[PDB]
Amino acid sequence: MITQEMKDLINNQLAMVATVDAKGQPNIGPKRSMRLWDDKTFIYNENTDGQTRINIEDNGKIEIAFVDRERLLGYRFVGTAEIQTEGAYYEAAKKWAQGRMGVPKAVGIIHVERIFNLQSGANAGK
Amino acid sequence: MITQEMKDLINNQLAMVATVDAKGQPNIGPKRSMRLWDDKTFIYNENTDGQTRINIEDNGKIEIAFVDRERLLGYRFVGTAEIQTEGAYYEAAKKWAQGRMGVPKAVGIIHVERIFNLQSGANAG
């Protein structure tokens, strides 16, 4: 679902993540550890329990955008998120962090459901 | 309440804008025209009838972020927003657009309530 063209941009740009709290306030922030798990899934290392973790545990809603500012290209990924503290995703996030950052409090997992282009704005699911 | 360092980042980086629709779904998109108006206000040129505009019109809630791709630097600005199609901001937005982009459909105005230093600073004001 995530194409090699998309992967290239993902691996060259910063993940910008939007979530929402209970009262409907959007929250935005970069996730510099955001990376692909497979062709339909992102993971990131959750180290702080900031608002993003709270929002995901509340309602699971999320959007991730990557933009190539220079070439005016990008992608928006829409899906469901969860937080895990045990299991395969978490242990992988733990190993990835070793020698790199602190031991993760949790791992965030994003299940991609729809993909949109960020020049056009059109659904790029084919 | 705006640092010169903040102004530098804002001028050199792309605003990413988060809003929410009437059903509570988040939306994120870039707005290259997002720019500081004064120390408590951003504006951007709205050239579309897209989701960011729809969401601002619905509930006014917004957060914007400017982040350096290559360095651990950036700022988050949280506040409320409105869309205008007439008045002084809109006239200013039209003048700004010439030689930069198309004639705007509207102007978005963001009233800053809180500032966050993103990767190294927590709150900044």
Question: Residue by residue, what is the 3-state secondary structure of A35-63?
Answer: EEEECCEEEEEECCCCHHHHHHHHHCEEE
Question: Tokens standing for B15?
Answer: 């605003």
Residue B30: which of A17, A61, A67 has the nearest Cβ? A67
Dist CA B117 CA A125 (whole Å) = 35
Q: How far is CA A53 from CA A108, A126, B14, B33, in A?
A: 8, 31, 25, 30
Residue of B nearest to A29 (CA): B65
- Which H or E run includes B6? helix B4-12
Amino acid A75 reads: Y
* Residues B125 and B117 sit within 8 Å (Cβ to Cβ): no
* Residues B15 and B44 sit within 8 Å (Cβ to Cβ): yes
- Summarize chain A as % helix, strand, coil (round to 5): 20, 40, 35
Residue B76: which of A28, A59, A118 has the nearest Cβ? A28
* Residues B67 and A30 sit within 8 Å (Cβ to Cβ): yes
* Residues A13 and A67 sit within 8 Å (Cβ to Cβ): yes
Dist CA B17 CA A16 (whole Å) = 10
Phi and psi (nearest 5°) for A101? -145, -170
What is residue B104's DSSP assignment? -
Dist CA B34 CA B15 (whole Å) = 6
Residue B61: which of A24, A30, A65 has the nearest Cβ? A24
| Residue from B11, B12, B20 whose CB has the most chain A CBs within 10 Å, to mutate | B20
Question: Tokens standing for B41?
Answer: 């206000």
Amino acid B52 reads: T
Mark yes or no for CB contact B20/A26 under 8 Å.
yes
Mark yes or no for CB contact B28/A76 under 8 Å.
yes
Question: Tokens standing for A16?
Answer: 């910008």
Pairing between β-strand A61-68 and β-strand A41-46 as defined by DSSP bridges: unpaired
Amino acid B116 reads: F
Residue in this structure with the two tokens 């792309």, named with its chain if needed: B14
Among residues A28, A44, A48, the alpha carbon closest in space to that of A36 is found at: A44
Q: How far is CA A72 from CA A23, B65, B92, in A?
A: 33, 18, 25
B93: burial class by Cβ within 10 Å (0-12, 13-18, 19+)?
Answer: buried
Amino acid B99 reads: G
* Residues B34 and B76 sit within 8 Å (Cβ to Cβ): no
Question: Tokens standing for B102?
Answer: 């198309």
- Summarize chain B as % helix, strand, coil (round to 5): 20, 45, 35
Mark yes or no for CB contact B28/A64 under 8 Å.
yes
Dist CA B87 CA B85 (whole Å) = 7
Dist CA B123 CA A35 (whole Å) = 27
Among residues A86, A87, A88, A81, the alpha carbon closest in space to that of A108 is found at: A81
- Which H or E run includes B17? strand B15-20
* Residues B81 and B63 sit within 8 Å (Cβ to Cβ): no
